[PDB]
Amino acid sequence: NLFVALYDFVASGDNTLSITKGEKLRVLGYNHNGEWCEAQTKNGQGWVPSNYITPVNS
Amino acid sequence: APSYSPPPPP
């Protein structure tokens, strides 16, 4: 469904994606240990920290 | 996915 970024995260290469606090996104998957998640926003796709996002509308 | 650790919450 839809998630929202809790904090700002700036992309650092290695297929990561920058996300802004309050920005909505779709979660497409997770890495082996669940620490990183594949996100899709209006800016594209890339990995973002899993603990930086939460479901839109708690 | 990155092999390094995601930064902790600010």
Instruction: Read off the CATH number of the domain in which A41 is found.
Output: 2.30.30.40
Interface residues from chain A to B (CB-CB < 8 Å): 6-9, 12, 14-16, 31-32, 35-36, 38, 47-52
Between CA A50 and CA A30 the distance in angstroms is 8
What's the CA dihedral at A25, A27, A17, A24 to 10 degrees? 10
Instruction: Report, in angstroms and rounded to the nearest whole number, the Rg of chain B calculated over CA atoms.
Output: 8
Q: What's the first-to-final CA gap in chain A, in angstroms?
A: 12
Resolution (A): 1.6
Range of the domain at A10: 1-58
Between CA B1 and CA A57 the distance in angstroms is 27
Residue of A8, A15, A36 lying closest to B6 (CB–CB): A36
For residue A23, give the amino acid letter.
E
> Experimental method used, please?
X-ray
State the total domains in chain A.
1
For chain A, the maximum distance between any two Cα atoms, rounded to a whole number of angstroms, is 30
